[PDB]
Amino acid sequence: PAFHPGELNVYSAPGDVADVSRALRLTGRRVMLVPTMGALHEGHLALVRAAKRVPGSVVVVSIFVNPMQTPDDDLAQLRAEGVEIAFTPTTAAMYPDGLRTTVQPGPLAAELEGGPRPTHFAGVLTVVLKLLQIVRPDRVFFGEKDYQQLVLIRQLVADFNLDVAVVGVPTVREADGLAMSSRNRYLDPAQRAAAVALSAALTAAAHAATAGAQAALDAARAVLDAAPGVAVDYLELRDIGLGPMPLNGSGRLLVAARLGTTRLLDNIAIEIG
């Protein structure tokens, strides 16, 4: 199993990537995992640089579309961001036995994004557990964009005593404020010019919050209401760990909305008072 440094090395077999990761961590190099699903956009690249600026770092980026909850291009971007290792497993190699032992998330997984799709987080956490066992990284990187996934991953790491640091990375935005997503490729300049409502409603809510939680929401609800063809799935104010109603201190505002069949998510830091 061969690792050519300063270059992009691509492994498919769990065993190879594991052996190398292990070899490397002996050499005093610190392994950083960036789990992806392919289709890398400027927003994944934030995740890569964050990892990259860790002194000693060897970066592993995994590209795996999990069938339960652009290979070349992604690789080019990677060779170009200076990434040394890409882990691209097959489905057979990740599920030789199908769904057998799986992770069951806590009750947070049935809410929000888990409300319509109630096994999605089980799917997600199960693969993240396998990735972190395969690669045993020092730190593992996730975008704040999918903030509920982030919190759930931290519970995973805590509840199972996993020896890995979870770094959440702040969302990356187009110049008008729209959260970068693959999904924004879909969207007529109709829908896509309306798409800016999500972040505008969030940033307004965040400013209005001096007047309280209640003003912050009305603000945001007012902004979406004034947007052509944005159908809200949810708009929700939570504590940073995604419990209740942030007392009145500080927390998170979350939004999910359809434009056509294209579902968008976004969230922001909020302080009340």
Added chain:
Amino acid sequence: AIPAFHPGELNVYSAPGDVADVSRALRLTGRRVMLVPTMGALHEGHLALVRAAKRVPGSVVVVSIFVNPMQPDDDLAQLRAEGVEIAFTPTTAAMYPDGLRTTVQPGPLAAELEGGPRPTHFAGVLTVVLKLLQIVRPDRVFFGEKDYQQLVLIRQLVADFNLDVAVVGVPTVREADGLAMSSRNRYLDPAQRAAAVALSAALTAAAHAATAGAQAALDAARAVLDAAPGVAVDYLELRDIGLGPMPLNGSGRLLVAARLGTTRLLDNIAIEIG
């Protein structure tokens, strides 16, 4: 600093973090870490787990002692006597600082056999095994075949989650009459202790009847059990060695469970069919 470690003696910690800092560090120096999960109240059975762990070139042995909700110096003195250098004895609160939250969900095998009476028992069992694995990160981890279904599910945990550890299954330690040692044996009256032999007697009969095939081995075992008073059989089942469907020839496993008074006893044995 790494916490305080004194070679050749019993070092105790109950801080998950302390035993993880120490485990890591010994490893970096060329000791191979062995873990023995126990629930306290040790006896020979546990002790042969401990000896198999010791007999690895360069081993440091780690015995955890913790009692598993969703499934004393007596004990440590046994460990000292056995030359074990690390005991791990965390509190319920240290293992579960946020309550039951994220847990392991087993394959369908967790529903069968022992998971008939206790449909959520193994979820509890695997969730804490995972945890200990992650805290201690041993090279090898040790279980008795006594609890064979347990041991097959731990193997499935290890394969499905891509865990770094070799699972070693340790041959059942028996009384002189062949009764599998278990803390529960202290409870059987003399009549029961006596009828209690029937379990192993049927399994070994089965194992030798087996050169005539599967139905022979099962009928042999059933006869031995029918010749016992006060032994209510929960199941008697033969399976392949990973616990799938009754095999047609070659390796396999025979499991039994039975109530004597209020005591529930278990036992299983390897089978070669024909």
